């Protein structure tokens, strides 16, 4: 008759709550590590969320489901594009399984390092720690028996102006300066 | 219980899902070579690659194009219904080499003769089948004539 | 926004295809592998039933096709059908007359094509 | 013809001979059982896909040790191929 | 590989595959029972089938 599936099994979460309880809602915030922008999810992000690609015409229920049955329930036939799509869809799986296999025989052979990142990343980025073994990272060992105190970040929003409403402070605040455009 | 987990301990690696968010023709040929090694052609393509060091060496250079996600292999075993007692090595050992775009061969001519040899092995399969049948029939006729004369 | 933040886990949704597709019985214990392993190896559309035949409507690989001229194999099997002189076509390696221009440094160009690159060609044509 | 969701049962059937090809016969047997009930209801007498799937069903019975059941089924397949207008040349070959 | 394109008969007609392994099974049975003439008959028919194809 009609087909609605989100899954290969056809299963789902319990889409409706018990009567008289509170519903579970999706996080509407775009998923970003930084808390400050706080930006609502785009339509495209909602389509990524609901198990499509970015577009209605890929990877969703809108592909996998046949456009038509017959009246008696006899289904459709396999298009060249349908078969090609099945090949792609299994190409992803083959890709994943081969990647995982490579990781597994790499840590079987023991080539997965205990030091995160490559050498290029190490000498680019002062985040990754120095992995020095038997020495202290910063000179010799610190004694065992606050940078912001002297560092000033105070952003001055409005620039302080020159007191023309007072005669003495006008001339005492004099700036002896000559405007020069670069030659 | 405020204690270290009792081991046998297993080591589980990671897997990078890589997505290309920028046009490669905007960028130099070295960045493009790196994107090629990551199996990315155009804007909008997504690939799955291993967490081994070489791959990170590649992803680090193109990081201003590629956006990355990580899945450790327990999570990869979860993402697809895969019984946990089944590893990925056996699963890889099962799937056929004959999968599309099987190898990285150095120039298109070699690619062409790779496919050509793929067809050649088919022809030789059927020919060897028929020829084997002719062989066995020949032996049956030989034994028959020998047992008949004697 | 064109800068989208979301895990790229969803660029490749696996919800639709589990390993039950590529490994037919994986929830059992045998790991059979059924993969349709190219886009090339598609055999074709075929009917589900006798009752509902597949319609006949042509493509350009069908509808535009000329009548069959006898090649050299068909006249070898059955000499009965060599009936007239037009069947006497020569060795198939003969393509026809030279139909175009070999223009230096750009390809084989077409008669009635772009002559912009013909300078070298024209000058070569009139002849430590 | 009466409505039966043939898409679903077909999916069920190919899962069936994946089971049979995969080296476990009992389960292919029950699968074919379900699907053959479906085709038995959905199609008229002596239809091609009906006798087809009970060819497969005879094949499934035969592998599990129910031999006589397989024999009975395949003879019924024969006498259904008998009463068919123009059966498939592939089906009679596979059957026998 | 456009000039060398090959399509195996064990694909495009399943009938041929069926009769082929049919005769293979028959020939095995003939080997077990000890019929020489039968086995020769079967392999001849099979050969003729394959080169007919």
């Amino acid at each position: 008759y009609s087909e609605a599936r989100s899954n290969y099994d056809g299963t789902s979460l319990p889409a409706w709550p018990a009567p008289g309880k509170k519903p579970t809602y999706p996080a509407a915030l775009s998923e970003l590590r930084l808390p400050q922008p706080r930006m609502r999810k785009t339509r495209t992000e909602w389509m990524y969320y609901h198990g499509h690609g970015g577009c209605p015409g890929k990877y969703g229920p809108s592909r996998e489901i046949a456009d038509f049955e017959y009246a008696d329930g006899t289904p459709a036939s396999i298009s060249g594009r349908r078969f090609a799509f099945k090949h792609h869809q299994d190409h992803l799986l083959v890709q994943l399984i081969r990647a995982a296999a490579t990781v597994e025989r790499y840590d079987a052979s023991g080539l997965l390092p205990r030091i995160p990142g490559t050498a290029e990343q190490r000498n680019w980025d002062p985040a990754i720690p120095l992995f020095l073994d038997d020495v202290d990272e910063q000179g010799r060992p610190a004694p065992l028996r606050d940078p912001s105190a002297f560092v000033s970040d105070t952003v001055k929003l409005r620039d302080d102006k020159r007191p023309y409403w007072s005669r003495r402070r006008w001339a005492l605040t004099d700036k002896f300066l000559v405007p020069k455009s670069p030659k | 219980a405020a204690a270290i987990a009792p081991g046998p301990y297993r080591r589980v690696g990671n897997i990078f899902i890589v997505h290309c968010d920028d046009h490669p023709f905007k960028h130099s040929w070295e960045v493009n070579r790196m994107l090629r090694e990551l199996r990315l052609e155009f804007k909008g393509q997504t690939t799955i690659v291993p967490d081994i060091p070489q791959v990170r060496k590649r992803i680090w250079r193109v990081r201003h194009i590629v956006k990355v996600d990580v899945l450790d292999l327990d999570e990869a075993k979860a993402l697809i219904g895969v019984p946990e007692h089944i590893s990925f090595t056996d699963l890889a050992s099962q799937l056929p080499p004959s999968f599309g775009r099987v190898k990285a061969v150095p120039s298109p001519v070699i690619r062409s003769k790779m496919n050509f040899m793929k067809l050649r092995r088919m022809r030789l399969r059927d020919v060897l089948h028929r020829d084997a049948l002719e062989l066995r029939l020949l032996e049956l006729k030989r034994s028959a004539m020998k047992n008949a004369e004697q | 926004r064109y800068r989208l933040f979301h895990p790229r886990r969803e660029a490749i949704p696996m919800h639709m295809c589990p390993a039950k597709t590529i490994f037919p019985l994986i929830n059992s214990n045998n790991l059979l592998v059924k993969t349709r392993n190219s886009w090339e190896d598609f055999t074709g559309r075929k009917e589900f039933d006798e009752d509902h035949p597949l319609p006949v409507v042509g493509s350009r690989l069908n509808g535009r096709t000329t009548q069959h001229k006898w090649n050299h194999w068909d006249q070898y099997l059955n000499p009965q059908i060599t009936q007239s002189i037009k069947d006497l076509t020569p060795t198939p390696e003969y393509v026809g007359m030279r139909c175009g221009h070999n223009m230096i440094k750009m390809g084989w160009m077409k008669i009635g094509g772009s002559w912009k690159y013909s300078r070298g060609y024209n000058d070569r044509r009139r002849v430590r | 013809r009466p409505y039966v969701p043939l898409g679903e049962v077909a999916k069920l059937e190919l899962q069936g001979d994946y089971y049979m090809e995969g080296g476990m016969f009992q389960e292919a047997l029950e699968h074919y059982g379900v699907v053959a009930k479906a085709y038995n209801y959905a199609y008229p007498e002596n239809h091609a896909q009906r006798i087809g799937i009970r060819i497969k069903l005879s094949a499934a019975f035969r592998q599990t040790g129910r031999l006589e059941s397989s024999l009975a089924n395949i003879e019924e397949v024969l006498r259904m191929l008998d009463a068919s207008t123009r059966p498939s040349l592939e089906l009679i070959c596979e059957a026998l | 590989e456009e000039k060398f394109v090959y399509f195996s008969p064990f694909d495009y007609d399943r009938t041929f595959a069926l009769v082929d392994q049919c005769l293979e099974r028959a020939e095995t049975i003939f080997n077990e029972i000890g019929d020489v003439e039968g086995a020769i008959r079967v392999l001849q028919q099979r050969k003729e089938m394959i080169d007919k194809k």
Binding site: - | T46, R101 | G44 | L89 | -
Partner: peptide, 29 residues
Amino acid sequence: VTRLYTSYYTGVLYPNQLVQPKQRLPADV
């Protein structure tokens, strides 16, 4: 250039893809 077929690729239209009819037993037999 060489194709990786990383993205989705539709198949080609090729003559092996013809819908080949099933052989039928004759009517009288």
